[PDB]
Write a protein that binds this ligand. Sequence first.
Ligand SMILES: [Cl-]
Ligand SMILES: [Cl-]
Ligand SMILES: [Cl-]
Ligand SMILES: [Cl-]
Ligand SMILES: [Cl-]
Ligand SMILES: [Cl-]
Ligand SMILES: [Cl-]
Ligand SMILES: [Cl-]
Lengths: 143, 134
Amino acid sequence: GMRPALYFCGSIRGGREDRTLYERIVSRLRRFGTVLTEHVAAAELGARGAAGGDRLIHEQALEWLQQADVVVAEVTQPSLGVGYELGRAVAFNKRILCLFRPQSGRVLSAMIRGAADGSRFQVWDYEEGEVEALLDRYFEADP
Amino acid sequence: MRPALYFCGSGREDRTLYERIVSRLRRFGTVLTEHVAAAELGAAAGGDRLIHEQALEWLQQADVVVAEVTQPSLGVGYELGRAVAFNKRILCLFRPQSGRVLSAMIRGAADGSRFQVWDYEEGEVEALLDRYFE
Ligand SMILES: [Cl-]
Ligand SMILES: [Cl-]
Ligand SMILES: [Cl-]
Ligand SMILES: [Cl-]
Ligand SMILES: [Cl-]
Ligand SMILES: [Cl-]
Ligand SMILES: [Cl-]
Ligand SMILES: [Cl-]
């Protein structure tokens, strides 16, 4: 409770550059609170993550998601898991920030774009090189 | 009245499979999907917001949610997330022959009962639906 609890959702399926962005976002998020992710759950479970391993990852991640004060998601790469975390987050009435790169050529899911209300659920477009500045802008106004 | 079924889905194999699944689900109930919401649009600003609110209403009304989860999709995941919170019975369908490893968050959502994740090969999808729904 000392610090805001932040939960981050993102995909790394696109390779090294996706991993670097993932780490860049999580690193800047730490400025503004404690950060938990599905990667942290999978890292802690190690070998047990195995038969039934995905169930333990899911239960641990959902437990952290439910406790979060803000849920941040990078929604550029299509991802069932990121969509699912967002859907659970909405039903937990979490404040949500989604980050999208229009550079990707992609059209953001209508279901995700359609969930934004401008305040409690927001979708921010960004380019390579400004995600740290935008995260600052978001959290320096709404810790 | 009839059981209300909500189908979540996203390539030739993919389109024909979507069509096959929706067709077979009609044997058990009426079927609504996100594409039916989008087709409601002819025009636009606020258009995605309308799709979202319409799909959410149909999802909340559904007796069973069925999702094809072979292709990565933020929408299908979002729908599943909302359906879990709506305490809905959920059936996900995954094709291992895709070469992909299903998302841990989806595979791990399964509890064997109200949330089930079934691997399948394309030729047997109608038979699996028959098994679930009869
Ligand atoms: Cl890369
Ligand atoms: Cl995925
Ligand atoms: Cl809109
Ligand atoms: Cl209607
Ligand atoms: Cl998507
Ligand atoms: Cl919901
Ligand atoms: Cl199962
Ligand atoms: Cl197949």
